[PDB]
Design a protein around this nucleic acid. Structure first.
Lengths: 59, 136, 23, 53, 79
RNA sequence: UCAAACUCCGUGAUAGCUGGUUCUCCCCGAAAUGCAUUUAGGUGCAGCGUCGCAUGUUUCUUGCCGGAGGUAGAGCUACUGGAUGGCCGAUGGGCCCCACAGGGUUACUGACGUCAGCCAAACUCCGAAUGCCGGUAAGUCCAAGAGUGCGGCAGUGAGACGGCGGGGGAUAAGCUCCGUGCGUCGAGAGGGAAACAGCCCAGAUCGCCGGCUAAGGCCCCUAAGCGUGUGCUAAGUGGAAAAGGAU
RNA sequence: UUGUGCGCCGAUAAUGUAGCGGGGCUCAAGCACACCGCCGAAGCCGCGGCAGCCAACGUGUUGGCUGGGUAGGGGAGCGUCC
RNA sequence: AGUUUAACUGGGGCGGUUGCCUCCUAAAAUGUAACGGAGGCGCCCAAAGGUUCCCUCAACCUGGACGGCAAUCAGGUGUUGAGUGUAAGUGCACAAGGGAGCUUGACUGCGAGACGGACAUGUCGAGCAGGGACGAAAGUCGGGACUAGUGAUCCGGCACCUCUGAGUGGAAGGGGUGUCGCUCAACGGAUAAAAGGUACCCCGGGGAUAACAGGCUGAUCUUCCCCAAGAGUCCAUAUCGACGGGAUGGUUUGGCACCUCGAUGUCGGCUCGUCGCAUCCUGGGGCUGGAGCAGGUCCCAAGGGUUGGGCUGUUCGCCCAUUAAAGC
RNA sequence: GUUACGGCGGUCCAUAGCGGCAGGGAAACGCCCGGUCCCAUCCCGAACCCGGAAGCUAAGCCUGCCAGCGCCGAUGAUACUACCCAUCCGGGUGGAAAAGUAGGACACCGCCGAACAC
């Protein structure tokens, strides 16, 4: 149902789109986690920044 | 010697050495061919040396096809000149050769002499290469 | 010769990941 | 550019009872200079000018 | 010992300026161009330099009319 | 002391030039690009910064729909040019029958066409991704401390290397010149790289004789594994290297 | 005879080993594939103090976000003399 | 006597160039540099402009008097390969190509909204009004198929105006509208007006910038190798091994310009060394087209030694006389 | 409504074209007769224009047939590529050609008019 996010890497060496999209998801620091919907918006952001986030699934 | 009789633009960029062959990846007109494996620019004098190497190793009768022609020049500029001040003049002519591409094709009956000849012509070239039969 | 090569070949280490500055 | 006696020469085109010089640059190795011409002047209307330099 | 080349000509900023979908007022310039790469259709006019422009407001539709890419304008819906 | 002395005065001459410019903390924070230039080491305006007011999310991101492109690539009896090998032989031509006309012959040179395989930054019947322009739907939202307009106050306008794409060069340079919502250094410490501005990780409010992790690494020097399992290596390979040679 | 994974020769400069960072290592302390743990930074967390922007409330309390910084812009202050 | 005498530039100089248009580079929007690659312009135009109407070429096949490869003609195929005033591109057969008749819009007064945009410049512009052209009318015409064909400002000049007229009335003069006068081409144009030397040189600065040296690369140079056409009486490999190819070393002529110009003292000689081996002799050795003496080529090998003299400033070199040998 | 009819148009304009075979002419489309009248040839009533209906569907045109000259054209794979991993090599998530192939296709649609009829 919902996706659970965990930021792993850092935003340094990282481009504008990746940085702005972490901001979009609400992630600023490392080890922050977010409970986000699994809609197309979210899936596209994760496709964008998969190397920065571990993604788990409650559902 | 191999050169064209005239090119429209006699100062060209350097060809690219990126990608694999699209055509000439299949022996066409003979029986025993040469196939490249690397990227390289092959000139006029190399191919002359190679065809002579083959004809002096069969020596009588048996045909040789050259599926390449040096239709792309390169520009040396005269010696001990500081960089700048233009682009040098064409002096030698290359053909680009992408991997998979076929250069030579022989038609001589005995495989012994033929394979040997192609090897002598391989050792006149800058590329790693191998020998091909028309078969699958 | 030697010096430039050893620079350009120390770059292929593991903690550099294939790249270094001024080669 | 300059004022040389260029092939494309001459100017001034004055009006009869119409003082509104209309200008045009033309050649002069051809014959003519006493016919054609027309245009709108001040207070007046579509009437006939000379090429008078 | 000279390179007799070197010259060039400054740009002219050609190409499309109002793509598909957009809202354009009147007299606005859709494309600047040398030849009629794109031709006029409906509610569209041509210039002297083969520029195009709008004659009626609306929105764009780059369609073809017998093999030639056109430009058009369609009626917006009044609010 | 002389390619035009010395002293006082003008005179505190002037220098697009070199140097130097003193106490503290708080907040934000660049640039090394463009056009012009008697100009290229300087400067003016635009660019990027901040302060104040105004306009309130208009900026940015992701998804979906609509639009032009002629790049990579590929293709060519789809045009302009190059070009490999065959078939024919007009047309040419040695030569023969000898009028030379005309009848022809012979590897002859081979159009044009024709079978097959090919190349191209200034060749394209074709044609990707990304990027781009607008619309829409949400997201971020006690914020990005975003955007736009205005006015004050400026600095910069000598950029470097690394990745990707490219020109000049010898497809050499720690070479030079352009691109890039790519990066870092500049202005950025700390850890790793043996030492090492630009590489990888990560962006330092101050303290703690607290804990978990990344890159990297665990025989001793050096804190952590002479760790487990299955195979290869005999060269000190590991811990530089080619064409090529070799039971 | 094909394709592979490690290997051999080719190999070769001048102060001193000197092209593992050293000792040393094949009774791998070397290469590969999987597995287990761990060490490790000024990163994140944990306990505390200060500060700036915003917001909520009450007669200045709390909370979230934030706080590297040169050219430079702005703000708030110590000190000396009369 | 006072002063000028340009800049770019892979140091400067010599050369070349400076503005505008077109194409590629240019990386599928726009834009983008180099002393990068190819060209062109500093015009022409009673029509080569406007409008109404009409038609389609080039090429090939054939026939055909001079006539041939081609001239004008006729008949077919011919979607467009010709031509478009002038370079190239984009377009043009629905023609913007070709042709014929009228003809002056190659006008005046304006201009919504837009592009591009440092700025000044620059580009199109529907639509309104007078007064017209053409056409039966609809409608098109504010130059040319499009983009280049030219130069800001100041100062003067010509025509017209119902603007002003230094007490009044006039006038000069100054204005205004339309217009002219510049290879100011170094083309955003320091003056209307300006070429050179300095080894007599001086000052301020710069490693932003060159020469010696270091450094990077290694075209070039040296050393070495690969393959083997042949030479070698035959015999590819005793010896030389072409045509091509691959690497070293960093000493050579050069490329870049990274530290040093608020000082790194530059050719050779002398004296004094020390190091490498890609070895001149000595020492050990394999093959021979090595009988023997002398050798030729190859491998290992650095301990020691490696002359004195003539010419040249010379390094290098040549010569003389010796040497076990007269090293790089 | 309808037939082998005519005319005006359209398709992001060849799936519609070219060529061959057969076949049709009621009214219409045509070709044809001739230059008296308007009008016209850079010369020509050939064309344009005018006046009529002797003649023929031969041609144009419409209908069916032939997938042959041309065109259209996928799925899947490949090339290339955005992003990420990766000490050179190469690889993973997504996107996705050209060519080739299977095949398609001798067009489709709209309006008015005729003829034909209840």
């Amino acid at each position: 149902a919902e996706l659970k996010i965990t930021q792993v890497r850092s935003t340094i060496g990282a481009r504008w789109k990746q940085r702005e999209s972490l901001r979009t998801l609400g992630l600023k620091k490392i080890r922050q986690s977010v409970v986000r919907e699994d809609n197309a918006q979210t899936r596209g952001l994760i496709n964008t920044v998969h190397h920065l986030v571990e993604v788990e699934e409650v559902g | 010697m191999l050169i064209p009789r005239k090119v429209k633009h006699r100062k060209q960029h350097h060809p690219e050495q990126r990608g694999i062959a699209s055509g000439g990846t299949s022996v066409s007109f003979g029986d025993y061919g040469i196939q490249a494996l690397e990227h390289a620019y092959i000139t006029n004098r190399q191919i002359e040396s190679a065809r002579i190497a083959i004809n002096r190793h069969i020596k009588r009768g048996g045909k040789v096809w050259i599926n390449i022609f040096p239709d792309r020049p390169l520009t040396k500029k005269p010696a001990e000149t500081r960089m700048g001040s233009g682009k040098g003049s064409p002096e030698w002519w290359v053909a680009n050769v992408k991997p998979g591409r076929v250069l030579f094709e022989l038609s001589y009956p005995d495989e012994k002499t033929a394979r040997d000849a192609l090897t002598r012509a391989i050792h006149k070239l800058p590329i790693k290469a191998r020998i091909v039969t028309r078969e699958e | 010769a030697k010096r430039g090569r050893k620079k350009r070949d120390r770059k292929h280490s593991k903690a550099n990941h294939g790249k270094r500055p001024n080669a | 550019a300059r004022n040389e006696i260029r092939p494309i020469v001459k100017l001034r085109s004055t009006a009869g009872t119409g003082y509104t010089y209309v200008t045009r640059k033309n050649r002069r190795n051809d014959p003519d200079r006493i016919v054609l011409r027309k245009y709108d002047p001040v207070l007046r209307r579509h009437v006939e000018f000379r090429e008078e330099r | 010992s000279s390179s007799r080349n070197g010259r060039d000509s400054a740009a002219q900023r050609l190409g499309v300026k109002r793509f598909g979908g957009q809202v354009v007022k009147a007299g606005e310039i859709l494309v600047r161009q040398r030849g009629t790469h794109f031709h006029p259709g409906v509610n569209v006019g041509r210039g002297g330099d083969d520029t195009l422009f709008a004659l009626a407001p609306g929105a764009v539709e780059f369609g073809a009319k017998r093999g030639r890419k056109t430009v058009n304008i369609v009626p917006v819906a009044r609010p």
